Ligand binder design. Structure first.
Ligand code: BCL
Ligand code: BCL
Ligand code: BCL
Ligand code: BCL
Ligand code: BCL
Ligand code: BCL
Ligand code: BCL
Ligand SMILES: CCCCCC/C=C\CCCCCCCCCC(=O)O[C@H](COC(=O)CCCCCCCCCCCCCCC)COP(=O)(O)OC[C@@H](O)CO
Ligand SMILES: CC(C)=CCC/C(C)=C/C=C/C(C)=C/C=C/C(C)=C/C=C/C=C(C)/C=C/C=C(C)/C=C/C1=C(C)C(=O)CCC1(C)C
Ligand SMILES: CC(C)=CCC/C(C)=C/C=C/C(C)=C/C=C/C(C)=C/C=C/C=C(C)/C=C/C=C(C)/C=C/C1=C(C)C(=O)CCC1(C)C
Ligand SMILES: CC(C)=CCC/C(C)=C/C=C/C(C)=C/C=C/C(C)=C/C=C/C=C(C)/C=C/C=C(C)/C=C/C1=C(C)C(=O)CCC1(C)C
Ligand SMILES: [Fe+3]
Lengths: 32, 49, 26, 306, 47, 302, 38, 49, 107, 38, 49, 38, 49, 38, 38, 38, 35, 38, 38, 38
């Protein structure tokens, strides 16, 4: 439980990153 | 008999169901099989002296 | 009985999936 | 009366260099402008550049002296190398050996000149290109904090050791040591004000950038035009913030908010740092007499122990 | 004895009062200006 | 006619398509009901009205439930249960780490759990309501993205890290001046959180956020009420620093730096709890990377 | 009309629900009743 | 607004009057139930003591 | 106190299986400290590393204090709040700070 | 319509689901019943 | 709205009346089931004691 | 008209509710009454 | 604004007057209840002592 | 025509999936069933 | 002209001032002279 | 007209109120008077 | 997009392979690289 | 105007003030002169 | 054209220089050869 | 022309200077030569 649950929560922190990354990729793709 | 003809009739939309299913099971199998391997090969933390 | 039940519920998941995907893939 | 081409493409001192402007390309795709453009060299940029170069050169060759002149130990310890101010003994004196704070005093003096002449450059180029001098005064607030850290708080404490040690790890160490020496900076109330203004700075920056990028389709980003007549993007921005939180700003007010939140960050920080050493030696002890410290009779310390 | 020190008060509470009050007043005037009538592009046309 | 401008300047009309329009007109033109997230999902937004200036959606009502209940639970735990009467000395503490992840109404720390759950409901409802209102105004989803960065910073501190640690007492107490005690004790437990690299990145982006905010407020205020060709600020920003990011670029960088600061920050506190116990010990590998192990003598060896 | 009837209904119903939840939680946490093992 | 009494015609629509009647009767029923619940909880454990 | 335990110092306490070549301050525990740094046993220890609000010391003494305190962090892996309430370091809340005073006097 | 039937249905159903979940979670966390090993 | 009684014609559409009837009958069935569940849980373990 | 009647109603009602909650909380936390197990 | 007395006609709409009457009567009832509650709480436990 | 059948299907299916996931996770975390470890 | 006289003057004067300060700083910190009590 | 009269009134009134509060709090915290329990 | 699925699958496979190799090597279970 | 007189005045005056402050600071901190009780 | 020749030249030359420096460092720090008093 | 001659000159000269400095510093710090008291 320690490492499985810990890594699932880690992946949620990185998921939180994800939206901003989508914003940057949006800017790049839509500015061609 | 469907309400999402653009999702269940068209090959591109019909394919999206299989794509989503396969991606969900691929991610779940990824995580589950990793943690299985890790917990079976990793030794138990050495018993306290 | 837990391994029995987990296998049972995964096969019910799979058979459900074959059934309704068969309908969608009709 | 202001030639925008002449201010960009004059030559020499009181002119620009790198005048054939390059294009970065990815900066144009991601940020919308990729021209590096010419950069001005105007007798204040020169003082700034050469005094900063003197400062950095002193610091770097003292890093070299500290690693026994070994350029690998240099690269390995570069981030924990630092040129520390003179120790507490002989604290304000400048007759300190070069290795024990002698290099720090010279480098810090040249850095002072560099930041002051950079302020002068900001001011003179704002006047030369026709814009207001708001950036020079914002830098002056930042410099108020800076000169408290390096000049005014070491003085009035009696020792140069109160100042940071010119290093990648030394500034973090300095912040730790100063909060530890004066109790707990969390109970420094002007530190709390400055954190209010810093986190409100980041909150307003994020909100402003996000609002303008969201209303970007209707050219909300052209603030100069929007301040003459508010277009549909600025209207949508105002309505978004009115419906979200019941009040809004226009194209002009929001930048007043921005400027003042950042300036207050710097100013309240300077005040709190100057107060910590000279007037209130202990912030937690002061916080108990101020009744702002929560009683903690029986803390659960299992959380904080491994 | 129940009373914080003069120092405590000055420092924490009148800056607390100033920040709260001043923020509220600045917001009041921010929105008076923002909701006043000035040159906008008519929405029916420009949009 | 005087022709009042958005800045507050009255310019005498000759010395554009603009007309002096009342805000009430702007506000009523842009109402457009029924575009919200709830109206896509259910076919209708249950609350599609405005209460005063505020838009009340489905997620606005959820958010206001969360707000009222969170404020009332906060003040119950700290006026009652603590008896303090002054908000600077009250101590809204989670259940003890002894209790683990389970919650008990009889045990202390129950009203912290309720305040945290209602505050999470309030914050997520605020985020979803921002999505509502951006959908109503045909805007981009950037404001919800930034607020989601900070809401995920809250989720990390009160949900993800306490769950991963497994004790629910690893959430920070909800006390003015006392959550600072938690921040200090967590910062020193994993000693030198300054050496935490995601923490250093977070501080770098916080300082850069305040710097960009000052520079942008300066730039827009400096060209505000002057006869300027809109290229004066660009020339100024190329004379200083030899680069002008442009109008759309400074707002993009604003949004991005703002969000990224707290994103790297929540990565820092989460790692600080679960994977790294000591942030000085973390950097033990650096002097042993094999490219500079061997070269040193005395204190100059490592 | 000073107050839309729908607005008053929403506000009153939400206030009543929030107050019922708050009072239930205060009474249950008080341990004064011996309800749900109190 | 025909169904509304003319006293309350400036305030209540025709449909709003019926929903108001439902709300009033629900509030009255809930009040009776709340009084009964309070009397029962007092007979069980007085909270004022 | 007995709450610590009744553990007593013996040979293996300091030798740990090595007769000679005993190295206090190995390079493992000198990670972010200066390698030349040693515990300042010169000072009178019930108050030797005290630094808070002193006004006759500055960041140099705070740095020496922090070297000693991180040495204690490594020596007992439980970190910095093992014997401190980090909101006030001068406080003797945790009672491992008193055991540490006894141990500083002992070393 | 101020009072659409669809709106009342959505609100009532969501309120009922939220309240059922809340009451289940309060009752399960209370440990007052011995349900799911309590 | 012909299927709707005239008293509720200002409020209920023709289709909304049938869905309302379904909702009412579902609420009544759920109430009966909830009463049965509460009586069973009380006979099992009284929560008021 | 200096004040909309709706504004005065909202402000007065919210002030009264906030004050009732505050006074109830202060009186209950004072332990001066022996209400809800003192 | 006919139902309003001419003294208060500059201030009160026709509908605002009825809602004001409701608010006034509610405030009066709440005041009577508050006085009764205070007398009861004083007879129970005087807070001034 | 109110209540499109498509809408009811989407809402019911999503509610059922969310509830199945929630109940599975609550039951697995309760350790009454011990994440199937037994 | 390729070189402006003002530029050379600024550069030379600033270099001379910086070098005078640096050399004074180095000589005073060396403690080799007994100047200002060394 | 150097100063709007309204501005001077606001500033003077706010300064007087702030100073009255500050002086009251300084005098009460000094414990020099025996006012409100010494 | 097929390119998106390819990128995601390839990156997941590489990350998985690295993670499993590192877990197996650190376990000291197999006699690989003097373990 | 290769050199503006105002520029030379500003630079010279600022240099003189900075140098006076620096020299005063250095001489005071040296403790070589018994100023203000050394 | 997939690759400018200048880009490939820059990348290859920088990679070669970085690798030469890295390998020299690694070999010198290894102490496995008596190079430079090792 | 793949490479401006000025660019190659700048890069080569800077690389040579950096490498000369690096090699001098490595050789001097090695203490392998007895140069400058090594
Ligand atoms: C075990 C005893 C516990 C307790 C545990 C619970 C639990 C557990 C629950 C309640 C719920 C309720 N309890 Mg209780 N309750 C207790 C003590 C009390 C006391 C009292 C003072 O002692 C009171 C007054 C109540 C009052 C109530 C009501 C709020 C509610 C039941 C009626 C209701 O409105 O919803 C009636 C419910 C309906 C009308 C919903 C009908 C839904 C239909 C039947 C579908 C059901 C879902 C179905 C499986 C989906 C199938 C779909 C497929 C596609 C076909 N409880 C004690 C402490 N109580 C229930 C509730 O719903 O909360 C809102 C519930 O969840
Ligand atoms: C005490 C002996 C110390 C030492 C301490 C110093 C100090 C201290 C200084 C030098 C400086 C210099 N030394 Mg030495 N120097 C030593 C050993 C050496 C040795 C040697 C191998 O031994 C050498 C070659 C040098 C070489 C030099 C030159 C670099 C320079 C002097 C000439 C020069 O170019 O500037 C000539 C200077 C001028 C042309 C400037 C003229 C400026 C005018 C006169 C204004 C002066 C300021 C005036 C007060 C302002 C008034 C303005 C009012 C408005 C009217 N030193 C020994 C170790 N050396 C001086 C220098 O300037 O460094 C650049 C200096 O500051
Ligand atoms: C706090 C500031 C208040 C205010 C408070 C007062 C007061 C109070 C008075 C005036 C009065 C005046 N004010 Mg006014 N006034 C305000 C705003 C304004 C503004 C504005 C810009 O709009 C203006 C233009 C004015 C203008 C004026 C004139 C109409 C008038 C005559 C002043 C004069 O001749 O001074 C000349 C006189 C002096 C300057 C004397 C200076 C006094 C010094 C301080 C010595 C005082 C000795 C002290 C009493 C003894 C102390 C002993 C202790 C008891 C131990 N006021 C603001 C709002 N104003 C005066 C008035 O109208 O008379 C009926 C007066 O009484
Ligand atoms: C107990 C003695 C304490 C002390 C405690 C206080 C306190 C406490 C106060 C002062 C205040 C003042 N003291 Mg003192 N003071 C002391 C020693 C001194 C000494 C001296 C050298 O010894 C001096 C010169 C002063 C000087 C002063 C002045 C600054 C001021 C009184 C006149 C003034 O300008 O405001 C005159 C005030 C007015 C003109 C305001 C008029 C306001 C009107 C009357 C409304 C009042 C509020 C009212 C209740 C609101 C009702 C509204 C309803 C809607 C109807 N103090 C000693 C140490 N001092 C008073 C002050 O106001 O500070 C600004 C004050 O608060
Ligand atoms: C006590 C002896 C200390 C020492 C302490 C100081 C101090 C202290 C100072 C100097 C300063 C200087 N010293 Mg010394 N100095 C020492 C040893 C030396 C030695 C030597 C090798 O021994 C030398 C060459 C110097 C050389 C110098 C020059 C750099 C300078 C004096 C002339 C100058 O240019 O400015 C001439 C100054 C002027 C032309 C400024 C004129 C300004 C006018 C008069 C206004 C003055 C301010 C006035 C109060 C403002 C009033 C305004 C009101 C509105 C009316 N010092 C010893 C160690 N030295 C002085 C200096 O200014 O540094 C730049 C100074 O501050
Ligand atoms: C002492 C033996 C050490 C060792 C130490 C080194 C060192 C030291 C180096 C290498 C480098 C290399 N080693 Mg080895 N190497 C060892 C063991 C191995 C083993 C093996 C399994 O055992 C292998 C396969 C290799 C493989 C290699 C290649 C990666 C490379 C040499 C060819 C190459 O591509 O660059 C060929 C190089 C060139 C084509 C560059 C040509 C540059 C021209 C000639 C300019 C040279 C600079 C010149 C002075 C500048 C003058 C400019 C003036 C303006 C005129 N090494 C052992 C452990 N190895 C060399 C390398 O370059 O790494 C990239 C190097 O630096
Ligand atoms: C003491 C012996 C030390 C050592 C110490 C040094 C030192 C010290 C240096 C080198 C440098 C080099 N060494 Mg070695 N070197 C050693 C062992 C080796 C070994 C070997 C395997 O053993 C090898 C292959 C090398 C290889 C090399 C080359 C990389 C280089 C010399 C040629 C070159 O390209 O630059 C040729 C250099 C030039 C073409 C530059 C020409 C510049 C002109 C002449 C100007 C010179 C500056 C002048 C003073 C400025 C005057 C300007 C005025 C205005 C007039 N060294 C041993 C360990 N080595 C030299 C180097 O430059 O590194 C890049 C250098 O600095
Ligand atoms: C819980 C309580 C929160 C609810 C409190 C507000 C109640 C709704 C108020 C609605 C009125 C309104 O909208 O308030 C506006 C001011 O809002 C504003 O920023 C007021 C902003 C209020 C800040 C509330 C802070 C929340 C605190 C939570 C944490 C503690 C002014 O309104 P009007 O000019 O009248 O425009 C509306 C007119 O068309 C109707 O007459
Ligand atoms: C210890 C603690 C914490 C105690 C807490 C004490 C408190 C405060 C308790 C609070 C209780 C409250 C307020 C409970 C609330 C109960 C409600 C509102 C239930 C709603 C039922 C709504 C129901 C069943 C709705 C059913 C909806 C149905 C059947 C919808 C059906 C449907 C509709 C209409 C369609 O589209 C088409 C057909 C379809 C079937 C899909
Ligand atoms: C220990 C310490 C610190 C002690 C502190 C001591 C202090 C300082 C105490 C301060 C007390 C104060 C200031 C109390 C305030 C009491 C108030 C304002 C009560 C308001 C009642 C408002 C009321 C009744 C409002 C009623 C509103 C109603 C009835 C709404 C009516 C309606 C409106 C308007 C509609 O459209 C339609 C619906 C309906 C008709 C119901
Ligand atoms: C722990 C350990 C030991 C790990 C190690 C194990 C591994 C992974 C080793 C890795 C080995 C690798 C990857 C080696 C790679 C070597 C390369 C890329 C060399 C590049 C040469 C590039 C060269 C020579 C480029 C030369 C460029 C030249 C001559 C430029 C010429 C010129 C250019 C371009 C001009 O404008 C004009 C003409 C001019 C001649 C001036
Ligand atoms: Fe802007």
């Amino acid at each position: 439980m320690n490492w499985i649950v810990a890594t699932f929560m880690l992946m949620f922190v990185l998921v939180a990153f994800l939206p901003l990354v989508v914003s940057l990729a949006y800017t790049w793709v839509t500015n061609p | 008999p469907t309400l999402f003809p653009e999702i269940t009739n068209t090959v591109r939309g019909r394919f999206y169901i299989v794509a989503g299913i396969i991606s969900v099971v691929m991610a779940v199998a990824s995580i589950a099989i990793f943690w299985w391997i890790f917990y079976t090969i990793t030794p138990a933390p050495a018993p306290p002296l | 009985m837990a391994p029995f039940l987990m296998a049972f519920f995964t096969i019910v998941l799979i058979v459900a999936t074959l059934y309704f995907l068969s309908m969608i893939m009709s | 009366p202001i030639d925008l081409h002449d201010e960009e493409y004059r030559d020499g001192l009181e002119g620009t260099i790198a005048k054939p402007p390059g294009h970065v390309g990815w900066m144009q795709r991601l940020l919308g402008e990729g021209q590096v453009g010419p950069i001005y060299v105007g007798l204040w940029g020169v003082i700034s550049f050469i005094t900063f170069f003197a400062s950095a050169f002193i610091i770097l060759v003292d890093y070299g002296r500290q690693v026994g002149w070994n350029p690998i130990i240099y690269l390995r310890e570069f981030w924990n190398l630092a040129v520390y101010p003179p120790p507490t003994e002989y604290g304000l004196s400048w007759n300190v050996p070069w290795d024990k704070g002698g290099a720090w005093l010279a480098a810090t003096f040249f850095l002072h000149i560099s930041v002051l002449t950079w302020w002068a450059r900001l001011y003179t180029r704002a006047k030369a290109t026709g814009v207001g001098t708001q950036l020079a005064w914002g830098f002056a607030s930042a410099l108020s904090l800076y000169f408290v850290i390096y000049l005014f708080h070491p003085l009035a404490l009696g020792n140069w050791s109160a100042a940071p040690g010119h290093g990648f790890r030394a500034i973090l160490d300095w912040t730790n040591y100063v909060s530890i020496h004066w109790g707990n900076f969390y109970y420094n109330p002007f530190h709390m004000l400055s954190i209010f203004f810093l986190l409100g700075s980041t909150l307003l920056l994020a909100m402003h950038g996000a609002t303008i990028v969201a209303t970007s389709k209707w050219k909300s980003e052209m603030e100069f035009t929007e301040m003459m007549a508010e277009g549909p993007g600025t209207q949508r921005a105002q309505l978004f913030w009115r419906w979200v939180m019941g009040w809004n700003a226009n194209s002009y007010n929001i930048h007043i908010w921005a400027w003042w939140f950042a300036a207050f960050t710097a100013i309240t920080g300077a005040i709190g740092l100057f107060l910590s050493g000279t007037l209130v030696p202990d912030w937690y002890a002061w916080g108990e007499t101020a009744k702002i410290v929560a009683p903690w009779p029986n803390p659960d310390w299992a959380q904080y122990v491994f | 004895s129940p009373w914080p020190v003069w120092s405590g008060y000055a420092l924490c509470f009148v800056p607390l009062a100033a920040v709260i009050l001043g923020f509220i007043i600045a917001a009041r005037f921010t929105d008076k200006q923002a909701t006043s009538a000035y040159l906008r592009l008519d929405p029916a046309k420009a949009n | 006619r005087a022709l009042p401008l958005p800045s507050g300047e009255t310019l005498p009309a000759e010395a554009a398509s603009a007309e002096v329009i009342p805000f009430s007109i702007i506000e009523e033109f842009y109402k457009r009901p029924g575009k919200t997230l709830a109206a896509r999902f259910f076919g209708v937004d249950p609350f599609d009205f405005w209460i005063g200036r505020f838009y009340v959606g489905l997620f606005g009502a959820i958010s206001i439930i969360g707000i009222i209940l969170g404020v009332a639970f906060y003040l119950y735990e700290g006026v009652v249960n603590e008896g303090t009467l002054n908000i600077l000395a009250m101590r809204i503490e989670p259940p003890p780490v002894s209790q683990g992840l389970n919650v008990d109404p009889a045990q202390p720390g129950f009203f912290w759990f309720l305040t945290m759950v209602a505050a999470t409901i309030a914050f997520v409802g605020w985020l979803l309501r921002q999505i509502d209102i951006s959908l109503k105004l045909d805007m981009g989803m950037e404001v919800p993205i930034a607020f989601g960065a900070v809401v995920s910073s809250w989720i990390t501190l009160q949900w993800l890290r306490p769950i991963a640690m497994g004790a629910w007492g690893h959430g920070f107490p909800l006390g003015i001046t006392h959550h600072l005690d938690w921040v200090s004790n967590i910062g020193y437990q994993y000693y030198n959180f300054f050496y935490n690299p995601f923490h250093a990145i977070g501080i770098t982006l916080l300082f850069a956020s305040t710097l960009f905010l000052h520079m942008h407020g300066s730039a827009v205020l400096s060209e505000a009420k002057r006869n300027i060709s809109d290229q004066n600020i660009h020339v100024f920003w190329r004379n200083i620093l030899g680069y002008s990011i442009g109008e759309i670029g400074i707002h993009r960088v604003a949004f991005w730096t703002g969000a990224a600061s707290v994103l790297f920050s929540n990565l820092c506190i989460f790692l600080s709890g679960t994977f790294v116990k000591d942030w000085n010990a973390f950097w033990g590998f650096w002097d042993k990377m094999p490219i500079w192990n061997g070269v040193g003598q005395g204190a100059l060896v490592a | 009309r000073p107050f839309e009837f729908r607005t008053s209904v929403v506000v009153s119903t939400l206030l009543g629900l929030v107050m019922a939840l708050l009072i239930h939680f205060v009474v249950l946490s008080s341990g004064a009743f011996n309800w749900l093992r109190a | 607004n025909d169904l509304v009494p003319d006293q309350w015609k400036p305030l209540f629509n025709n449909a709003q009057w019926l929903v108001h009647d439902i709300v009033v009767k629900t509030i009255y029923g809930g009040l009776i139930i709340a009084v009964i619940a309070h009397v029962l909880c007092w007979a069980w454990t007085p909270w004022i003591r | 106190p007995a709450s610590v335990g009744g553990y007593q110092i013996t040979c293996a306490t300091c030798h740990n299986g090595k007769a000679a070549g005993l190295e206090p301050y190995p390079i493992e525990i000198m990670n972010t400290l200066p390698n030349d740094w040693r515990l300042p046993l010169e000072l009178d220890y019930p108050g030797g590393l005290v630094v808070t609000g002193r006004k006759d010391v500055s960041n140099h003494e705070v740095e020496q204090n922090q070297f000693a305190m991180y040495h204690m962090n490594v020596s007992m892996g439980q970190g910095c709040t093992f014997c401190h309430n980090a909101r006030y370091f001068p406080s003797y809340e945790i009672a491992q700070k008193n055991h540490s005073i006894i141990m500083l006097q002992m070393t």
